[PDB]
Each structure stands twice: as C-alpha cells, then as structure tokens.
C-alpha cells in the first residue's frame, strides 16, 4: 500500500508483531519498528528472565564465537523473533530482512513521521485482562542492555517537543474547524452533504 | 464460575474525601494525605452518596472476586489511616545484654540504631520510613513506638527493625532476644 510503515512498538506482543512484520517483508512491504523497548511479552517478568537465560547458556563449546549469539537490546531481541519466522538463509530471505528496520526509541527520521499500530499484535486487545506480562526493555536491561536510561532521557525530551507540535496542531485544527463551521449551511455544503460529504 | 456481579462498600467518614480517577486512589483526611495505585486490579469504583463508595467486579472468577475485598480493605485502612492513625509499639527483649536503641542520623537520614544486641559490637541501623514518626516510649521500659497514616509504611518499618535483630547460630527458642512488635492500634485513643 505505502512506501514505508512505521510501527510504534509500545504495547505490542513480540511474537505477534514479529509474525506480521515477518510477512510484510516477504510480501515486499518495507517496515520500520520504533520503541522496541516498550514492546511486550506475554507471561510474567520472571519466566521471561528465565527463558532468556536458557537461550543464554547455549553456545558452541569449543569456540564460544561460532555458537549462537545472544543479543540484549530490545530491537535485536525482536529482530531475532522476526528472523526466526523468515527463510533468512535463502536469498529471498536476506532480501526480505533488508526491508526491515527496528529501533529502540524514535530516532530523528520518524519522529516527525507517522507511526501505526497492528491490532492483532496489540497487547490490550489480545490478552485476557489481568494476565501478567513483560515490558521488553526491562528484560533487556536485566540481561545486559546498557542503554535503557539514555533512551528514556531522549524519549522524554522528545515527547515534550511532540506535544509542542501537537499543541499548535490542535490549535490550528481548531481554526480549520471554525472555517468548515461557517462554510456549513452554504450552497456548496448542503450539496456535498447530499452526496455524502 | 464467573459471578456476574459482586461488590463491597467503602464507608467514608466525616473529615475524609477520596478521589479516584482511573485506578489511582487518593484519600484526604484531617490527619494527612495518602495515595495508592490500584491499576493492577480491574474493578469499578463507584460513588453513591459521598458517605459511601462501592467497588464492584463484574463477571468475576474465584481468584478475581477474592481480590475485591482486599481492594476494599486496602482503602479502608487508607481511610482509617488518615483519621484514627496507626501506632505500632514494640518492646526490646534481652535475656542478658541490654539492647541499646537510638535514633542516629547522618546525611539527613534518621535511622533506628541498635547497639550491643547479644553483646554484638556490630551496630545495626534500620532506616526510618518516611511518614513514620518514631518515639521511644516514656515511663515504660524498652518500648519503641512507630506512628503514621500508612499501615503499610508503618508495619514494614516495624518488621524492618524487628528483623534486623534475628539471632544467628543459636537455638532461637532459648535465645529469645530481639525487638518484637508489642502492640498495634491507632493514634487517637479511645478509638
């Protein structure tokens, strides 16, 4: 449909967001994910802490390098769940995975771009209420992700400028709605009304 | 089996005004001000008459209804906390070595400070929770007193001190020393 789709990660279930993002790529849609830190995982924090440590303990024994690589940062945790749903050892796979970017936070392109939500990955809609769950950044930071606080500081600084933006917008789009307000009742209006507008 | 409706009643007294928006709860009494975040629960708080607030769980399961009352109680103790108050008295007991208990503060701190426990040269320090005021009880021996509007904040700062005094490497039912919670009740007496 669109050239690039920005997905606010906040409030989404990793594996369900992963599965849709995996498929967008394979069908050619470029995807960029933001706020991977505030991604969710079903299940209470401790289990998810344990699970990662199980991941953590697997490595090629004679050389720890060639064995599995354990990434900490929420994006790479999420890129991993996403890579795991793609054919990535093929060329078509590498191809699909280039169409994807994942970021913790919202870096400078995309902070003034528009970010979407995938309801079938959305935690609020998906989980039975009162089922314990996990914010991804908090997990990442307990397995060694060092940047949780920077992202927070930047996001809060950023979240302030976005309200300045939204403030002026809500004010100007109050003027606009006082403009259509008088053009209502007009000859042109009540005709557009007739056809559905 | 999913009870379709169940509720409880927070009865609201005179000098008290409680304000609940989403699941943040604020109780304003003449004694003080207390706020508690219930967003982990999933209930509907409903005002009826300003003397009474109802809290209900719709279509609830066994464990879910169970959480209803412990919501009510939590608020009740918030109201009774902001009016009557909470006074926890606890008395040091020592079979031989007298337990030297004090409030020292460095870096604007205010801790309880316990010396010579079982002749321990080590000095125990339990920090003073904000909202609890300590006083050592006059006229009664080896009594210390913790007072505030938060049961939670108080009774922790009680067991705080009470557990710094655990004894190691002896039969505990012989060596009974420590500082144990003597009594728990409210700040304004006759109530």
């Amino acid at each position: 449909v669109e050239p690039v789709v920005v997905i606010d990660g906040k409030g989404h279930l990793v594996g369900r967001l992963a599965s849709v993002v995996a498929k967008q790529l394979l069908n050619g849609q470029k995807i960029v994910v933001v706020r991977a830190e505030e991604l969710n995982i079903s299940g209470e924090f401790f289990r998810n802490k344990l699970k990662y440590h199980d991941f953590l303990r697997k490595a090629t024994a004679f050389n720890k390098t060639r064995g599995p690589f354990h990434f900490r940062a929420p994006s790479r945790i999420f890129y991993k769940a996403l890579r795991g749903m793609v054919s990535h050892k093929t060329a078509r796979g590498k191809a699909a995975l280039e169409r994807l970017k994942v970021f913790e936070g919202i870096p400078p392109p995309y902070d003034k771009k528009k970010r979407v939500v995938v309801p079938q990955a959305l935690r609020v809609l998906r989980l039975k209420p009162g089922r314990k769950y996990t914010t991804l950044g908090k997990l990442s930071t307990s397995v060694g992700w060092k940047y949780e606080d920077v992202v927070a500081k930047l996001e809060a600084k950023r979240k302030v400028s976005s309200a300045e933006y939204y403030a002026k917008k809500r004010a100007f789009t109050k003027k606009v709605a006082s403009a259509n307000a008088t053009a209502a009742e007009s000859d042109v209006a009540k005709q557009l009304a007739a056809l559905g507008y | 089996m999913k009870y379709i409706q169940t509720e409880q009643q927070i009865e609201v007294p005179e000098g008290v005004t409680v304000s609940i928006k989403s699941r943040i709860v604020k109780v304003v009494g003449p004694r003080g001000t207390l706020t508690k975040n219930l967003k982990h629960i999933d209930v509907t708080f409903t005002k009826v008459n300003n003397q009474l607030i109802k809290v209900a769980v719709h279509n609830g399961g066994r464990k879910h209804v169970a959480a209803l009352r412990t919501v009510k109680s939590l608020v009740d103790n918030m109201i009774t906390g902001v009016t009557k108050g909470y006074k926890y008295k606890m008395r040091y007991v020592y079979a031989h070595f007298p337990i030297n208990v004090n409030i020292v503060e460095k870096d604007g701190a205010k801790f309880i400070e316990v010396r010579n426990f079982l002749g321990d040269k080590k000095i125990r320090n339990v920090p003073v929770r904000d909202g609890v005021t300590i006083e050592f009880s006059t006229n009664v021996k080896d009594e210390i007193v913790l007072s505030g509007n938060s049961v939670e904040d108080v009774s922790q700062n009680a067991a705080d001190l009470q557990q710094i005094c655990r004894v190691r490497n002896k039969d505990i039912r012989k060596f009974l020393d420590g500082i144990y919670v003597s009594h728990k009740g409210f700040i304004t007496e006759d109530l």
Partner: protein
C-alpha cells in the same frame, strides 16, 4: 492530472506450491483492497502485466512486460491465482504487478 493508473495494484507472492514442491506455471497474486474470495471473483479473467526494466533496448524502449490473466481465486483471504505468457521469474516474489480492468463486464 496526478494519477493515470488504469490498473489495480498487486503483488507477486509465491508460485503454486505444496510445502515440498511448487508449480511455476501458476502464481498467487494479492490484489489491493481485495479481501474475500467473493471480492476476488470480480478480477477473474482480468489481465495482469508484470512490468520490468532491462539493459538492452528492444522495440525502442528499455521497458519490458510479461502478460497474463487471473485464472481463479485462492483461499479465504482473497488472494488470486494467475497464469502468464511465460512463468514469472520467482526472483519477483514480493514485486509489484498490475491488474487491469479489462476484459470488462461493467
């Protein structure tokens, strides 16, 4: 004006396949705005063109086109099946494609 498009946007998804083996003679097409199998029936028999560029000029242009038709529908999400003058290269899986409004029955 701005928009000259007389086709409907589409995607080259996969060949016809089982999990084990495929059939390059048949492709599966996703058509924008088509949702349901019954949504898909409209575009049956319509004509697809996969447009692509090349290095050599041929007839006087560096653009070439493979041409095919929409033969039948696929599953419950309104993906559609299509067969082409020659089989699409499969390097094209996830490439855009064009479903024209003719042959028309409107």
């Amino acid at each position: 004006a701005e928009s000259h498009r007389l086709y409907v946007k589409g995607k080259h998804l996969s060949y016809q396949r089982s999990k084990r083996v495929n059939n390059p003679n048949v492709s599966l097409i996703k058509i924008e705005g088509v949702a349901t199998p019954q949504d898909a029936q409209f575009y049956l028999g319509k004509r697809i063109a996969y447009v692509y560029r090349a290095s050599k000029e041929v007839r006087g242009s560096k653009i070439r086109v493979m041409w095919g038709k929409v033969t039948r529908t696929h599953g419950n999400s309104g993906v559609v099946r299509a067969t082409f003058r020659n089989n699409l290269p499969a390097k094209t899986f996830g490439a855009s494609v064009r479903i024209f409004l003719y042959p028309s029955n409107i």
